[PDB]
């Protein structure tokens, strides 16, 4: 590329920068380049080493992560400090965390994991913690192990808050149940074991069997699209029930072969 073109590109870039700066500086809001630079120089002295202070950085981190800070000693898991953002997150006042131990605040099944994690520089795990006014939520913890006050070790971590008329069943390309959700017990009355291994047609009223077979042949060919069909189904109580089944093959994301047909049968 010719030198002149590169130089012209640089000139245009610099002019764009100057226009942006002129727009930004309150006093300018058109003077020449020199006056704009002087006004910006003077303006930047009415403000003000780091771009952002510590309080502002904390504000940004809380706006990005929706979490709280807590420090817990290694030996006894005793909370030594907890930010005031624990209240919005876990609806639990700071007084409920001070003096307690970390283990009291986590689900009983996570206690072993946490005791293994706090044992004695980074640390990262996933644990459930209790909500106040037991409801639990999944929180991802990130932090490190250090000496304190600035065995005398304490984990400084920041907890990030990680974000019926129908039942779902799968089928092979022949119609044999391979997975039946537990909602089948209420929806149609059969236990999940009662249906596994039996062709869906066997439960269909004789006159509408052909429609179901045609649908099962069509959906394997449509190869991705849905296909709804209504037919009568024999319930455990020998009562004929109208049901609607929306089906569409599932194709492996890499090989595009058919894994299984999933149907969402709904009681009408």
């Amino acid at each position: 590329e010719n030198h002149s073109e590169i130089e012209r590109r640089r000139r245009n870039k610099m002019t764009a920068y100057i226009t942006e700066l002129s727009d930004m500086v309150p006093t300018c809001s058109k003077p020449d380049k020199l006056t704009i630079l002087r006004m910006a120089v003077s303006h930047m002295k009415s403000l003000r080493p780091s771009f952002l202070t510590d309080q502002e950085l904390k504000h940004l981190i809380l706006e990005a992560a929706d979490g709280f800070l807590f420090i817990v000693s290694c030996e006894t898991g005793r909370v030594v400090y907890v930010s005031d953002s624990v209240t919005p997150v876990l609806n639990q006042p700071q007084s409920e965390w001070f003096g307690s131990t970390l283990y009291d605040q986590v689900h009983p099944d996570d206690v072993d994991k946490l005791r293994e994690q706090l044992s004695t520089s980074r640390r990262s795990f996933i644990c459930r913690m209790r909500c106040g006014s037991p409801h639990f939520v999944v929180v991802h913890c990130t932090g490190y192990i250090k000496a304190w006050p600035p065995s005398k070790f304490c984990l400084v971590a920041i907890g990030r808050l990680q974000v019926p008329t129908e039942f779902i069943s799968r089928h092979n390309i022949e119609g044999i149940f391979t997975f039946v959700d537990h909602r089948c017990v209420a929806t149609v009355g059969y236990q999940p074991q009662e249906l596994l291994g039996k062709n869906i047609v066997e439960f269909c009223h004789p006159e509408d069997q052909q429609l179901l077979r045609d649908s099962f042949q069509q959906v394997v060919k449509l190869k991705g699209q849905v296909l709804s069909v209504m037919f009568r189904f024999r319930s455990k109580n020998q009562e004929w029930l109208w049901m609607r089944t929306s089906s569409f093959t599932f194709q492996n994301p890499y090989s595009d072969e058919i894994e299984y047909i999933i149907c969402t049968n709904t009681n009408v």
């Binding site: 020199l34 930047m44 940004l60 800070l69 990130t142 932090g143």
Partner: protein, 314 residues
Amino acid sequence: SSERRKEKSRDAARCRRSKETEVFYELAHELPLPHSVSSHLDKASIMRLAISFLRTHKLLSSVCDQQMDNLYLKALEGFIAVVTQDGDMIFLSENISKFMGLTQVELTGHSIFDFTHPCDHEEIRENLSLKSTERDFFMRMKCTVTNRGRTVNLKSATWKVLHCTGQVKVYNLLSCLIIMCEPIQHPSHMDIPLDSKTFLSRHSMDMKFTYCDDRITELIGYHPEELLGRSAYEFYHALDSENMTKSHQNLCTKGQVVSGQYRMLAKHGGYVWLETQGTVIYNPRNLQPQCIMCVNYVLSEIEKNDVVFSMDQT
């Protein structure tokens, strides 16, 4: 007369140049940087940093217990980043140089689209725009840090996948996307210790188990041999197949993915919850993918252990 004009038009320009170059270095100290660094910045860099600083201050003016504030940054696994609706990075955490190797001064004010893989630009453009103020996606962004911990020139930069999480906020309209980027660590090079609730597994590119750790026998009940060759899509609870399909697509297209929370049916009935962390292994002879590697976190104990869901449980 033309001569005298040309002799008085070659003198004014010199004075103008001198004044401009002096004012520019007047503006280079007022930036919040050490004087040594700011004394060697070119003019474009000075303009960039000044604009970015003013923009950030305008932001915190609309957004806006002092001894423990300095622990927030060190207690984070990743770096912060503020991106405007046009793709201009108007702030980056100081610990960025530890994850990517590119210092903050080298990035601040640059357009994001310059440092991300071209195929991911549409994704980023969709996320930055107010189409739910929350955002969560994966992107690739240049990393000059080698596996051994060295730094290399930008031209030799590799691609690093960052799990971006955050929200977009509107300020009275300027829409700035605040994100906390978390690098997903390679399963090979792991420094964080693994809890007792973890088991490793390997897969082929179509998600068929090729090796599973023995601890799955204790955690879920399956033997390692019972799983080799059987598609991992058979064991997912049918209500999570969509999420796992999305995760598999991202894993194949981008190289790494961190799964949601799903359910893997257990041997004798019922299902345990899980989270997984996927990492593709490339062959360096032809750069062709070989096999997915995973780290599985078990979150709970077998729930609903009196239930039978799939044929393999009977």
